[PDB]
Design an enzyme around this catalytic site. Structure first.
Site, short mmCIF file in Angstrom:
data_model
loop_
_atom_site.label_atom_id
_atom_site.label_comp_id
_atom_site.label_asym_id
_atom_site.label_seq_id
_atom_site.Cartn_x
_atom_site.Cartn_y
_atom_site.Cartn_z
CE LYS A 195 -3.96 -2.15 2.28
NZ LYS A 195 -3.23 -3.41 2.56
CE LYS A 240 9.42 0.07 1.02
NZ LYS A 240 8.71 -1.15 0.57
CD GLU A 296 22.26 -6.78 -0.31
OE1 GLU A 296 22.34 -6.14 0.76
OE2 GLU A 296 22.68 -7.95 -0.43
CE1 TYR A 297 16.21 -9.38 -7.29
CE2 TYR A 297 18.43 -10.01 -7.88
CZ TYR A 297 17.08 -10.25 -7.90
OH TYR A 297 16.59 -11.38 -8.52
CB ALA A 298 17.37 -10.38 -1.47
CG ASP A 317 7.40 -5.27 11.14
OD1 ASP A 317 6.57 -5.99 11.73
OD2 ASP A 317 7.23 -4.86 9.97
CG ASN A 322 9.70 -7.17 7.12
OD1 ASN A 322 9.30 -6.77 6.02
ND2 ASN A 322 9.20 -6.73 8.26
CG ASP A 337 10.37 -2.76 6.05
OD1 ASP A 337 10.69 -1.58 6.31
OD2 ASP A 337 9.32 -3.05 5.44
C1 LIG Z 1 5.66 -10.06 0.23
C2 LIG Z 1 6.88 -9.56 -0.41
O1 LIG Z 1 6.98 -9.57 -1.58
N1 LIG Z 1 8.00 -9.03 0.43
C3 LIG Z 1 9.21 -8.53 -0.20
C4 LIG Z 1 9.29 -7.09 -0.53
C5 LIG Z 1 8.91 -6.90 -1.91
C6 LIG Z 1 10.18 -6.89 -2.68
N2 LIG Z 1 11.26 -6.82 -1.69
C7 LIG Z 1 12.56 -7.10 -2.28
C8 LIG Z 1 13.65 -6.21 -2.05
CL1 LIG Z 1 13.46 -4.76 -1.07
C9 LIG Z 1 14.93 -6.49 -2.61
N3 LIG Z 1 15.12 -7.60 -3.38
C10 LIG Z 1 14.09 -8.49 -3.62
N4 LIG Z 1 14.05 -9.67 -4.35
C11 LIG Z 1 12.76 -10.19 -4.29
C12 LIG Z 1 12.24 -11.50 -4.96
C13 LIG Z 1 10.97 -12.01 -4.81
N5 LIG Z 1 10.90 -13.12 -5.53
C14 LIG Z 1 9.73 -13.98 -5.65
N6 LIG Z 1 12.07 -13.34 -6.14
C15 LIG Z 1 12.91 -12.34 -5.80
C16 LIG Z 1 14.35 -12.21 -6.28
N7 LIG Z 1 12.01 -9.35 -3.52
C17 LIG Z 1 12.80 -8.28 -3.09
C18 LIG Z 1 10.67 -6.63 -0.40
#
Ligand SMILES: CC(=O)NC[C@@H]1CCN(c2c(Cl)cnc3[nH]c(-c4cn(C)nc4C)nc23)C1
Length: 254
Positions: free
Chosen positions: A18, A37, A86-88, A131, A136, A149
């Site tokens: 949201k 973001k 950073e990208y996870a 949190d 997260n 987060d």
């Molecule tokens: C419910 C939910 O999606 N929570 C995660 C937040 C959205 C993206 N966020 C990410 C953030 Cl902040 C950074 N890197 C990410 N990578 C992913 C990801 C999701 N999938 C299915 N595959 C990958 C790779 N997500 C993020 C935070």
């Protein structure tokens, strides 16, 4: 380094909340892959969360740890605020949890170890997360855990992961994360939080009275650690070092 949206090529959305959506993105010059973001200043202002967001950035951009998601910087345009993160690559523990249903003691204890280290660091700088929840928790390229987060974090809703002292409006310190750590250990092993109910008001009573039960397949070593972490009295909760050297952790971690 002041930024601008024109420096990034935007890819697939990673999450739609949201507050705003977060996308996969690539900086044009470095070809650096990251997560962007995007928040709506209007949607922000109308909630007055404009404060802690600035605190979120201020706190997160100062924290450097392998198990903590890194914030590279930010910028805003005429109508939006952009957070460069950073990208996870391996997604969330949340999706990992609903695929595998439960975790083994090895994967669980390893996550707890990584979490404890991240928190120990956070506590050293006197920052508490508050949190800590599976959505997260993100995963790195080696599958390592990354706390991700801090929009509700400060210096020393959804009840599931909160401690009695926090829900009862009382005073709270670093010990609240130890409670959350226990709630996660349970959820990792069982597949659902120890105090889950169908109503907020009922989850409240479960937490307030510390009312959880163990399914038959939870081993005594795990039951012991969890029971130690899930104490109503914050002072009776173990220090992070004591968690890191718990026999069940030592036996199963990596
Ligand atoms: C419910 C939910 O999606 N929570 C995660 C937040 C959205 C993206 N966020 C990410 C953030 Cl902040 C950074 N890197 C990410 N990578 C992913 C990801 C999701 N999938 C299915 N595959 C990958 C790779 N997500 C993020 C935070």
């Amino acid at each position: 380094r002041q930024w601008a949206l024109e420096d990034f090529e935007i890819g697939r959305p990673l999450g739609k909340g949201k507050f705003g959506n977060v996308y996969l993105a690539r900086e044009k010059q470095s070809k650096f892959i990251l997560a962007l973001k995007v928040l709506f200043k209007a949607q922000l202002e109308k909630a007055g969360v404009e404060h802690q967001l600035r605190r979120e950035v201020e706190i997160q951009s100062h924290l450097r740890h392998p198990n903590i998601l890194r914030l590279y910087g930010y910028f805003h345009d005429a109508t939006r605020v952009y957070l460069i993160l950073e990208y996870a690559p391996l997604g969330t523990v949340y999706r990992e949890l609903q695929k595998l249903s439960k975790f083994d003691e090895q994967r669980t204890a390893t996550y707890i170890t990584e979490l404890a280290n991240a928190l120990s660091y956070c506590h050293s700088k006197r920052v508490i997360h508050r949190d800590i929840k599976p959505e997260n928790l993100l995963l790195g390229s080696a599958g390592e855990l990354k706390i991700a987060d801090f929009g509700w974090s400060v210096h020393a809703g959804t009840l599931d992961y909160l401690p009695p002292e926090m829900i009862e409006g009382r005073m709270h310190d670093e010990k609240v994360d130890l409670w959350s750590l226990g709630v996660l250990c349970y959820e990792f092993l069982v597949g659902k939080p120890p105090f889950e109910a169908n109503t907020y008001q009922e989850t409240y009573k479960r937490i307030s009275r510390v009312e959880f039960t163990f399914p038959d397949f939870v081993t005594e070593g795990a039951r012991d650690l969890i029971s130690r972490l899930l104490k109503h009295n914050p002072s009776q909760r173990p220090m992070l070092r004591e968690v890191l050297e718990h026999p069940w952790i030592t036996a199963n971690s990596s």
